[PDB]
Structure formats: structure tokens, C-alpha cells
Amino acid sequence: AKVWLVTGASSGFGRAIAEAAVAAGDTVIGTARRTEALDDLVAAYPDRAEAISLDVTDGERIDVVAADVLARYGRVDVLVNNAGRTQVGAFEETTERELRDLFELHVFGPARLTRALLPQMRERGSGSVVNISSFGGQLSFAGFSAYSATKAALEQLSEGLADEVAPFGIKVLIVEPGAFRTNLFGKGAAYFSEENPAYAEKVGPTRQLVQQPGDPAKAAAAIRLALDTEKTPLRLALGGDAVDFLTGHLDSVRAELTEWEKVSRGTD
Amino acid sequence: SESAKVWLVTGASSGFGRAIAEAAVAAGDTVIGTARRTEALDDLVAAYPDRAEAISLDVTDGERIDVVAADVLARYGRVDVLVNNAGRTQVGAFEETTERELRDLFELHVFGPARLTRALLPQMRERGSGSVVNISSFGGQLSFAGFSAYSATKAALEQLSEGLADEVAPFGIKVLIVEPGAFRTNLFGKGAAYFSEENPAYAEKVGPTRQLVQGPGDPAKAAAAIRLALDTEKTPLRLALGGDAVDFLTGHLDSVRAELTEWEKVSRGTDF
Amino acid sequence: AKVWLVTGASSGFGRAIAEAAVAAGDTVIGTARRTEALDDLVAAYPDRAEAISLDVTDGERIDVVAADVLARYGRVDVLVNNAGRTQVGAFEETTERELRDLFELHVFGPARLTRALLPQMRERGSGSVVNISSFGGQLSFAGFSAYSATKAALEQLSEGLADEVAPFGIKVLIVEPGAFRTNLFGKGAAYFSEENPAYAEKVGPTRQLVQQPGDPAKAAAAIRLALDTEKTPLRLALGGDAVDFLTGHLDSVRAELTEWEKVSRGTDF
Amino acid sequence: MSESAKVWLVTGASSGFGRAIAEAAVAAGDTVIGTARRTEALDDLVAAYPDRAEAISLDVTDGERIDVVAADVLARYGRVDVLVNNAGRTQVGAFEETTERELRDLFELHVFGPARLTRALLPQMRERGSGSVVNISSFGGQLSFAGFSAYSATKAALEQLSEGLADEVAPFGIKVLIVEPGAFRTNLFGKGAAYFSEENPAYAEKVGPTRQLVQQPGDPAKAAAAIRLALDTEKTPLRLALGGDAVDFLTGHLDSVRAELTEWEKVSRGTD
Amino acid sequence: SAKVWLVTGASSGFGRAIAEAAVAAGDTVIGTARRTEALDDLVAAYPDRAEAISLDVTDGERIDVVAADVLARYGRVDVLVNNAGRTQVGAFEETTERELRDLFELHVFGPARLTRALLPQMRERGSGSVVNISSFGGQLSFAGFSAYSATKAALEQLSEGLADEVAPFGIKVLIVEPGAFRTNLFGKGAAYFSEENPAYAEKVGPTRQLVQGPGDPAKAAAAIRLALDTEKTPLRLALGGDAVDFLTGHLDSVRAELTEWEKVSRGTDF
Amino acid sequence: SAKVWLVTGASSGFGRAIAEAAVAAGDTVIGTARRTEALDDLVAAYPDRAEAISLDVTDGERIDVVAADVLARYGRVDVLVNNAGRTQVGAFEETTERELRDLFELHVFGPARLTRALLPQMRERGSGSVVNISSFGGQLSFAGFSAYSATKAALEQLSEGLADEVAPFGIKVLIVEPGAFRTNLFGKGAAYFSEENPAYAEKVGPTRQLVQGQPGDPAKAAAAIRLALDTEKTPLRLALGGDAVDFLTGHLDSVRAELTEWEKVSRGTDF
Amino acid sequence: SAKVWLVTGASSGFGRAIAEAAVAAGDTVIGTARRTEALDDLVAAYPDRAEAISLDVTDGERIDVVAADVLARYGRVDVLVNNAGRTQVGAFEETTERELRDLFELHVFGPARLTRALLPQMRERGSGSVVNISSFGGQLSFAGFSAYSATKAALEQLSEGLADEVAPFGIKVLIVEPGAFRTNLFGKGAAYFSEENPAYAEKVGPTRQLVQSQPGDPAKAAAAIRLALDTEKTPLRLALGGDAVDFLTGHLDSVRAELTEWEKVSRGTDF
């Protein structure tokens, strides 16, 4: 029986991941902004699920919650960083406040929480850190700059960490979903900047993209499968759409590198 | 007669930025180089007293970014090429990196450059020409032991750059992500570097990264390649510089591709 | 020759109103968070259109903008409070911050601008205050509580003011649009709270409503028609969808009042 | 507690309509928590009903104190069946005379306070699958006139919060009632605080009459019995008008809004 | 007879070797680090003789708390080793006041406060050792080393003055002046390098290389223990040939210059 | 040509003597003191070539303002002399953290900030002098003198590293190491002596006696400084007084002796 | 029945002498000092009748805590001795405001605060002594001694007013006016010297030398204080040492002569 701590557990992937752990017999602590958002999970598993109030934006609260969960449970086996939100807007339209906020949620908060729980994993010689990224963690396009920037920062913190904690048997999994249904599991908040005529043609489609094919329950099962495989992948894309964006981007980056390779190598 | 292109280079007092600034002035461009202390740039201004100016700028200071950007526009009328170069080397285990260290690196490498770019974008747009050159690293696409914070900042800068490029292409604005390896520090000097304490839990992994970051590129050749990239009809999104950068980038591309391929069945199976 | 000040002129309905004013021969000051969005308008009418930077969440900047306009233009004849955003969230899912932020854009901001520009209208004995509301200014439903609350506040500020300034010859018009096409004038900002499964059945359809038939240029022309009438209507609904929502809500309020009237009147001494 | 008894939480319970509601609840065998700024105001009711009535100090303006008081009641009583958001102030003055401070203060009392308190008690109502939220509005919740703009703006906001919430929470068996009284007799129950702005010459003719009106009186005891009838009816009305004045005002305004919509309908519909 | 060692900055490099030597010889060690977790490996290896305590030596109030707590639970500290610090390289002109103050905090003020906290109980016993980890740079400087040398020399002179005062109490004061040690077993300490501008690159470049990298830190830790086990403990213990050479060069040059100018020096009498 | 001297702590001791020697030699002097009135005599004697400016060297803000004002109005500073300071004697355990920090502010942080403020214009011109008033205590210590010596040594080492860095720009760095000087004609800085209990009296007592008092003439010290600055190779250090010379030699001898004593153990750590 | 003595500045000199004489007389002593180290031997030698408490009399909050702590644990204080302080020399013009304020904190405000905290329990009991260690300087001054004299004189007059008020309660107030005492046995108190200004050197120099062997025996001084307190009519003032007696009679002679000379003028100003 593993102890799971899942941030943003009241909606989307977080909720589906939290439900799948309790269903498998694990012990889950789900965090959300409002404890009561997880009232149904807790009332159905009074013994193995707990809801805690946590704003991933609040560093002080992160330290309190990490310490309280460690104190009362003795350990965290799996950390899942799922707290977050959707944001679409032109680079120029994104305010510094909106940019800093998204980084608090997707980067600084998850890093602080991860840092708080890493030592007991290292000391035990086992544990998993599961970071909910996006295909956006490797690529961007019109309207997605702030979002991709935050997810790519998360991804590179994960890559670095993974290399460091492999010796301790710690698994780091970067999950890269595409679009998933929201009727059954809900979703996190979403903000869409004013579209000004200069950007509408480019940014407009990204608004549609973010505003169907994916099953959150099947996603959570694939995450558990990847964690339970001998060699856990560093990244797990989820959805045909995510896969398509990722391969197309790998393709164009390699093409450009080869094209400019002689120039690149000539600066030696 | 033609108006000379106006280059604004941040962290232009040493290293790669000083090579880029030098390249611009020797080619006839007008250069505003920035540094925390203007006196850091005395040698540049002494050499090019008519075409080079030194302005005091801490890229961690958002109010000052806005003041400098507005001041440069007021006196030069425009900025043709913005080079976001300011920054530092940083090495430490993820567990060893303090929140303050992580935040300070994001200020320098992400928030400051984002603010400066937003301030200068509108005049590029209204003119219908301009270049934003963001100095990244092979670490803007990949990471390893001791490099987590650095790679995180550069990847954020790269993704801001990818999004922006897609949005401003219709305006004729060029966005260039530069991904160098290590350069010789002979004439131009070196940028600041911080190395976290290495404890025995991480030393075997983090140790080599410290060495990698400490020390053979030619910064002048690198600076020429940037200018070539900017002068070409199809300006690439990325320009890696140096053999090690290319090797690192190719190895990461391969590893990512191989992993995607292996896991593709599972990835595609999550639909209804 | 009238001086129009239009907030949120950057996109959607605000752009259309400002565009209609200049096409009519008036002088326009359009405000937005960023001036760069209004550049083509200023380019087309360089002597009669100006773009000013204004976040209506910032009380100090409202005061500065208002004073600057009155100094350089001498007056404001028509004030249009249009700045704002669409918002969707279950009541319980709305954080206090999401609630207060919407009240800044739709209520406190407009109230402050209006107070600052009211004295000069009152001294001149003419002026119009045009408050961009919604069918939501009179009614609400799942997912729409915060939005409706802000717009209803704005409508009732407008009702009380209208009665107060009528003797000064000042016009107050509450405009109640449905949804407009935004392929021409650009789409406004939109905020959506976290979605909870327990609420999805109800909030679902509202998200979809917000995320077509209205022509914003026709709406702008309707506003000016209403203003040009000697007895300006207090309210001007725009679009069949808005009229339908409003008549639906008026029907149900009326039926309820009738049903409970005996009990209601019975509570007096 | 008797098996059929209900827990009522009434804000602003020490005087006026809120006092009458609190008193009607105890008389009906219910258990009451009444709040006020000075708890000592409710001493005489607590002494008359030691085990079924409690006074708790609360400024609805104070959101931290809201959360504490709500948690306290739920801990100690186990539930709240009926919440009455009654705390409030009468306020009159010209739009132009009202300070931004006075406006924000009235929004805190009438809108943000109740919103937070409601939000805090809604989940125990949902889990139990029964409960009532009773919001004390005014005829002013649907209409305004000279001197009344701030007060109407706040009541209308509270009403629309209620309308939206009502639609969301009906599936859970939760009742949401908007009460719309006129002025009440004050001889037996007293009244709430009241502020009347300076009336300058330019507004005296319009605002004067509003001051008089706000200052045909309702019977608060019968008004409280009507709230209880409305809540006990299978189809609870969304709105309950109270008094001939409120009914006249509300029906007269619906009439005018409808007539105007009719007159302008061709113009309204023509915007496709 | 077991001794209680308190070693600041004990998790990596030289301090960790000093901690290792102590526990290997049967003494008790309290090692400090900004995070207790940095020391997990030492506590794992020596569960009964090593403890890790969180201490940021730039935090004076935390210094008082940690010293009192150690006394409360161990009853004494026999050997204090002021080891916490960092390497720092940069031109005098490029060094910010903040960077200068932070280095003084780590290398001077923190050590002074901690020493003060722990002296009374050594006086009371009539025994103890204060071991201050300096450098050849505690006696000399050169391009890029100004801030570093300044902090180490201050620590040295505090030490010289203290040694002369506490000798009658049976307290030993040892200034250790190491050169470059191998960092392959216990990791390396933190290091900050300033930007190196063209005006200073030729002079400061070689200093960056010198601190970036021939010495055995295990032998260095043994030499410290030997110097303390000796009836007459030297005031200074240079460690490494490189240290000896730097120190001799500076002695020679200071003496040559004193002599060259001596006639002028002596002619200022009233 | 005529040089511009900025002298901190100009109202007493070496600062006063150096300021008077500069103006007598035809140079221009800006002297600083906490109370400008302390420099009234200087300004009255040389109304056109001396100026008094108020400066507390513990106030970095004020340091910045004064440095900029002097550069703005004089156009340059040729010679910076750091003489601001005070004296303290007391057992290491008697010295409060506050007293310790205050000494470091006066002797180290203040002079460093002022030096950094004036270095670029020296570097740019290719000429200039930095004159730091240290002590034999900048190389050595003993009972009662720990705090003082620690601050002076910090200053010495900042000077060593700086001197090496700016030699290529022709800038002179001069560490002045005086012994005991008469104070009846030039005065001196404030002096504090901690409580001296019987347990420390035998060791600390002699140090109090030594700093309170005599042999040295500050006017002659000022001339020796100007002589060192005017010589082709300026020494990095200038001791002043036979007493300082004996202190410094004795310390060199014992440091060298102990190095040699333990040398085999030292070299034994090499792989 | 042994009395409870609270002695400030018990760490050296006179305060230590007084604390020791009290334990030797069989009394109970609480000695207070910024640092307690010097008192270790007294505490260990008399573990049941001597205690050392850390107290900086400049810190009013700490005065309050310590007064309260002693009253709660011992039940009372019979004899309060205000002895904390330092020596200080400087020309009036060379005395900075901070130097003047610091000396007033030590010699005036702290002692006033401690006395106030302990007076109620004396008043309620109907017995007690307040012993204030002044100086001949509490009545007179001369070059270099103005701050010291000003603080001691203020302490003396607080004492004169207090003595008159608390006489009817049976409380004794004793102003002790010592001259220079030997420091080789009991140790030496802190000493502060203002910046030296050459314009004052001839006047202030001799005073500096005055405070920098000494005739007085602190053990004999302690015995005389005890005798003064044991006497039914305790004198208001007790000079100690021939030097003190001579300074004081010199001052009384001059004040008396000047009063006489100007009496007619003085009395001529009546309405």
C-alpha cells in the first residue's frame, strides 16, 4: 500500500489519478483550494482518502502541508503535481502578473513541494514524482507561450532531477497529455486574454484547441502502468493528438539542426 | 545613405555578449550595451565612442527595464535587434537549490527578457521589421545532474520564443533562439557563475557537470554565425553553436524519439 | 461635434462603438489596458481618434486619465463603460478573488469614472452615460452568478443615477446585448472557474453559450438611435437572444408576484 | 434537540427584521444562532431560551471572522439548516455624493460577506441534501431611483448571486429564497443602522422624498411567518415580496421594463 | 576518553573529512549544514556517534539556539571547528557590497558569535580547542581574491588575539591554512565567481583557475588532530606544499619591503 | 600638476596631518568628518584649496552622495585617503557583536564602498592613489586587540588584492602601518576600553597601556607618505615608527619559525 | 536575619568589592553585570548566598524582568546598589550626542528605572537602602569631565529628592562619592574617550591622565559603605578617599565665596 499525495485532486487528471489509487487499495491525500471539493472521494473511502486545503501558490502553506502529511502518514510514496490552470493569449497580451502567476502554479510551487518530499524518498530508496505537463512542455505556438514556458521549465527540472535520483531508485515521470473530456472529472480554471485584431488569426485557433478525445480514467491507468514497469519512461505522452504535436516538433528541430550543422560545428 | 541598425545587447560587458556587441560595432551597427555598472563597458565605448553606448541595467529590476527601453527609443528612435544575453552559469543538485536561487535565476533568464521584449515589440511591429535574439543553451532543450535550474530557465525562454515567433512572423519580425556550448574566455572575459555545495549523495553525478561548465568555442565565429542566421532569407528558429551543443541536442532528440516510439501504443490507447 | 470616451475600446463592442462615433463625425478617446490595439483607428482618423492606456481596476489611473481628458479636450459628452470580461463559474466554485476582480472591472471602475466625469456634464447641462450591461443584468442561471451580480449592480447604479440627473438633461442608457460576432471586431477576455463534476450538468451549457448572431456595428447604430431620442429608454436590449432571456425572466417574476400577492400584502399592519 | 427542530443562523439578529426572524424561529421550536456586532444586544433572548438561542459576535464585513464563526457553529451544532443573510444598513444619497469608500463598505456588508458565509455553509447542505439560504434583499433588489443607487446596486448583486446559485443547487434539494420587504414598524423590534448623505441643492428635490420613504409600514412578525410559509411550500418561490409597498414598487417596475422592451423590440431584434 | 566535536559546514569537502576523522577515532560529532538532510550519509554510517543539525551561520539567533541545544544535550563541546563558508572570486571593482557583506557573515561574524557562545563552558572546564579553517589567503591576497583574503585575514586576527587571551585557561586556538585538496570523496563546497570583464580578465582569470583546480583531505584532517594532540599546539597549521609556498613567498616579500623602507619608517620620531 | 585629495577622518590624527601637508604642498583637499566644524581651521587657512564635507563612513548612502558630489565639482579625485576610524581594546569575549560590526563598518565596509566609488575614474585616467591607514595590527594581534586587528587585516587584504588588480592601470595602493604617535598637536580618534577583569588583566592590561601611552610625529608621517607616493616604485606597505617595525619583524619571525617547525606535516598532506 | 543585596556592575571594581563584603558579612547577594563570568568564583564559593544575573542597565525591559525575577524568588531586596557605569573623558565640544546619551542611560535612566521597580517593596516593608555610586564629580566638574559630572550630578539630585520623600518610610539613601581606587585586585571598569581635538589638548590632557598608582582600597571603601548604612543617621553623602574630599572642599570653598561676593546683587532682584 503506497501513500499518494496529489495536488489539484478535485478535477481533471488529479481527480482521476486520486480515484484510481484508492480503487487499487492505496492511501490518498488529495489537495485542492477548497477541502470540500473532494467531499465525495472522502465519504466513499473514509479510511483511505483525505482532503487537505492547499494553495500551491503559497510557499508557507506548502511547507505546513508537506510536514503535516509526513507527520501523520510517516511518508509519501508518490507525489503527483497536478495543480494548475489553462492560459491562452498573445505573448504581447500576457501581463507580467499573469506570467508570474502561471509560473507560481506550474513551477515554483511544484518544485518547493517536490524538494520538501525528496529527502524521505532518497533515504528510503524508493518513490515516484509524477509531473503533469503537456505536449506544450516541449513546444509552443501562437497563444500558448506562457503556458508552454511554464510546462517546459517543469519538464527540465524533472529531467535534471531524474538523472540525480535514479541512483536512489526514485522514479520521475513527465506526463504529457493532449485534450481530455471534462464532463465526468471537471477541469481546472482557464483564462483567455483579449484577442486584438493583430493576433486573432494566429491565437484564435489555440483558443479552440484548448476549449474531447481523451479518457481521464484511461490516462490514470497508463500512468500506473508506466510506474509499475521495470524501466519507467521519463516521459509518457497521452493521446494521439499529443503524440502528433511531439513527433512533428521533434521532426522540425532535427531538420533545422542538420541544415545548420556545418555552420554550428564551424564555430569550434 | 542608410540608417545604421540599432542593436541593444544585455549583459554586453563580458563573454559572448561582448563578442556579439563587438561584432555589431565592427560591422558598422549602432550598439547600446547594458551591464549592472556602465563602467563595466569602458573598453567598448573607448573603442567605439561614436557608435557604442553603455547603459546601466539590472535585468532583475522590472522598473529599470522599462526606463531603459523607453530611453533607448527616445534617443535612437528604434531598436532593430534585441539580444537578451544577460545571465549567469548555475550548477547545483535539485535538492540543494534554494528557492531564492531558483527565483533569482528565473528573473535573470526569463522574467527580465520577457519584460524587455514586450517593451520593444510594438515598435518592431509598427515598422514591420526586427530581430529578437535570445541567448539560450543546448540546456534549453535538455537537462542532467546539477543543471536542473539552468535548463528550466532556458527552456522557459525557448518556449516563450517559440510562441512569440509564431505570432510575429506575419509582421516580418525574426525570433532567433541561440544554443551555444562552452566558449573560450580569452579576450572577452567570462560571465558570473554560481556552484552549489556538492554533498556525497550527489557528487558523482553533479561533479562532471561542474567541470563541463568550467572547461572550447570561438565567440567571434559564434557572433558571425548569429549575423549570418539573421541575414539569411529563411532565418532558423534555433542556431546551435559548437560541436558539443550539436552532440547534446542530437542525443536528446534520439532519446526522446526512442521513448515516444516505445510508448506510442500506450499513449494512443487513452481515447474513447 | 461630440467627445466620446469609450472604455475597453480595444475589441468587440467597444471597438464598434468608437468606430461608429468617428464615422459619424465625433471625437473619440478609446481606452484599453494596451494602446497598441487601437492603432489602425488612430491611423485612419488621426485628428479625431486617440488611444489611452487604462486599466479600470486601477482607481488612481482612472482619476489621472479622466483629468487628462478634461484638460486636453475640455469636456466629455458621451461616456461609454464597456471594459470588462465574460466569466463562467458555479457559485461555490467562485473564489473570493475571482468575484472581487469581476466587481472591479464591471462595477467599481465604472462607478469611479462616472463620478469623475459627471460634474462637467452637470455644469454644461448635457451628456450621456452609456453602461454596457447584458441580459445578465436582470437575470442569472447556473455558471452565471458572478457575471450577473456585477451587471445587475451596474444596472441599479444606472437606474438611481438616471432619475437623479434627468433634471440636468443628462442621458443614462443601460445596454443589454446578447452575443455578437467577433471575426470582425475581435474576441474579448474570458475567465472560467475550475469545473466540478457535481455542477457540470448545469454549468456545462453556460460555458458553451459563452464560448455569433449579433452584428456589433448594427448594435452601435442602435445605441446612437436610442441616444438621439428625446426620451431615451432606460434600457436597450440588443439581439433576439437577449430579448428572449429578458421576457422569459419577466414572465416568471410576474407569475410569482401574482401567486404570492395575498401573502405579500398580508404582512402589513 | 427535538427530532423535527432546525438550526437557523441569522446575521444581524439583534434588531428589526432579523430579530423578528430569530424570534419566530425560537417560537416554532427551532434552535437559533443570532449574530450581531455587540452580542449583549441579544442578551434578553438568550436568557429567555437558554438551550435554544445563542448570540455570536460578528461583523459580516470581516471575512476571517466569517470563516471562524461558520466553522464554530458547524463544529458545535453539527449543522446549519437555514442561513439568513440579514445583516445590513439602510443608505441614502446621490450617486455623485457617495464616496468610493461608502460604496465598497456597502458591497462588503450586502454582497461579499453573504457570499462568503453562504459558500462556507453550502457543502454541509449538499452532503445532507437539504437546507435553505434566505437572502434579505429589498424591492430595491430589482429597481432604483434618486438617492438609492448604492443600496439598490448591492441588493441587486445579492439577488443575482441568489438566482445563479438557486439554479445550481436545486438538484441537491437546497432552497434559495430572496426576501423583498419594504419598511417595517420599528416600535417593537427596533431598526438597523442608517446613513443619509449630505443633500446638496442640485439633488434635494429628487433625493429628499427617498429619505422620507426609507425612514405604509410592514409587520416584521407576520413578515417572518411568511418566510417560513414560503420555505415550507413544495414549490418555494425564488422571490418573496413583503408588504403592499414592495408589491406596488416591484409590479410597477416590471410593467415599465416590459413596456419599454416592447416599444424598442424591432430595434433590438434588428441587430442580426 | 571521547571528545565532543562541533563542525560547521560538515556535509562536504574539508569539513566532512574532519567529521569523518573524529567519528572514526571514537569521538562524538555534531555536524551542521543549512539542511540536516545534507548530512544523511554521515549519520547513516555512524548512527551512534554523529548527529546532523540545521544551521545557517549567517543567522546569529540560530547560532545561539544551536550552541545552547548542543550544550543542553551533550553537556559540552570539546572542539569547535569553524568550517562553514564558500570560495569567492572576483575583482575588487566588480564585488558588490552585498556579496562582500555575505562573505564576512559566513567567514567572520558567524564564527565569532559561535566561538563566543561556546567559550564559557571551555573556560569552566579548563580545556577545549577552537579550530578555525582559514587559507593561505588569511595572510595574503592577489587579483580576484580580495574579498576572500579579507574575510580569512579577519578570522586569523580574531584568532591571534583570542589565542593570546585563552592560553591561561588551557584553551587551544588553531588556525588551519589549507591549499587545494581533492574533492572526489566528500564533494566540494559552494563557489561564486563574479563576472570577469576585459579590464580584469588577464589578472583574475588565473585566480579562477587556481580555485577551480594535489592534496589529501584525509591526511589534512589527521594533521589537525595531531596538532591538537601536541602539548604545544601551533597557532597556525599550513596544509599542502602549495600553501607553504604561497606563505613563504609573502613572508619574503613583506620582509624585503619592510627592510627597503626601514630608514624612512624609523625617521618619523618626534 | 596639482592633485585632488579626498581625506576621510580629516579632523584628527594622520588624516589631519595628511590634509595639512597636501594643502601646504599646493594640492587641493576635501576633508571629511562627522562634524564639519572640526575642519574650520583648515578651511580658514586655505579658503580656496580646502573644503570640509560632512560624512559618516558608516552610512553607505551618504558615501555615495559625497563621492558623486566631489567628482562632480572637482572633476576627479587623485588621492583617496581612508583615515576614518576609532580604537577599541577589550577581551574577545567582552566585545559585543554590535561593537564588532561597527568597527568593521568604519574600517572595512565604508572604505571599500568609497574606494569602489572612486576607482573607475582612476582606472579611466590611468593614474591615482589609494591610501589606507592601517596599523602594525593589520598583520598581527594579541590580547585585547582581536577586534581592531581583525578589521585592519581585512582592510590590508582588500588592499593587497586591489593593488595587484590595478597596477596595470598605474594606480598606487599604499597600506600605512603606524605605531604610536603624539596626539597633542593633531589629536586622535575616539577610544573605548572594555571592562578588564582579573582573569584577563595580566594579558589585556599591557595592550591598554600601549594604546593610551608618544614617540611618533604625525607631520613626519605625512611627509613619509607623500615621499612613498612620489617614488617610482611605491611600496605596498609603509610602516611608520620603529615600534611598528619591531612589532612587524617579531611577527614575521614567529610566523616563519612556526611554518618551518611544522613544515614536514604541512607538506605531508600532498599526494 | 541576613539582608538581600542587589548590586549592579558587580563584575568589577567597586561593585565586586561591595558584593564580596556582603557575602563575607553573611548577607545574600545578587550581582548583576552585562556578563556574569567574573562572578563565577563568588557563586561557586558561596553557592547558596551568591547569584550572578546578566543585566544591561541600558535595557529597560530587562531591568523590569530582573527586578521581578529577584522579588519573586528572594521575596525582597533590602539593599539596592546602583554601581553599573563607565569612566568617560572628552571636551564638551568633542562629546557627540550619542556619547552623552549612552552615558546618561548607564548612570541615570537605568538606575532610576531599577530604583522605581524596587521602591514599592521597601515602602510596604518600612525598611531598605538605596546606595548610589556617584563620584566627587557628582558635585563639580572641570575640563574633560563634563558628561561624567553631568550624569553623576543628575543621579545625586534624584537621590536628594528621593531621600527626603522616603525618610518617613524608614528607607535610607546613600550617595557614595569615591575618588580613584586600585584595580589590580578587583579589576577595571569600562572607559570611554571622545575624539581628541588639539584646541583642547592642554585642558583635557591632564584629565585623561587622571583617569588613566591609585590611592583607594575598594575593600575599605565597601567597609565604609556598610558602616554608613549600619549607622542610625546614615549620611546622605559619603566621600571616599582624600582626593575626593579635597576636590569637594575645593568646590564648596569656591561656590561659598562666589555666593558671598554676589549676594547683594542676588538679593537686589526681589520685587
Ligand code: NA
Ligand atoms: Na566558471
Ligand code: NA
Ligand atoms: Na565616520
Ligand code: NA
Ligand atoms: Na582607562
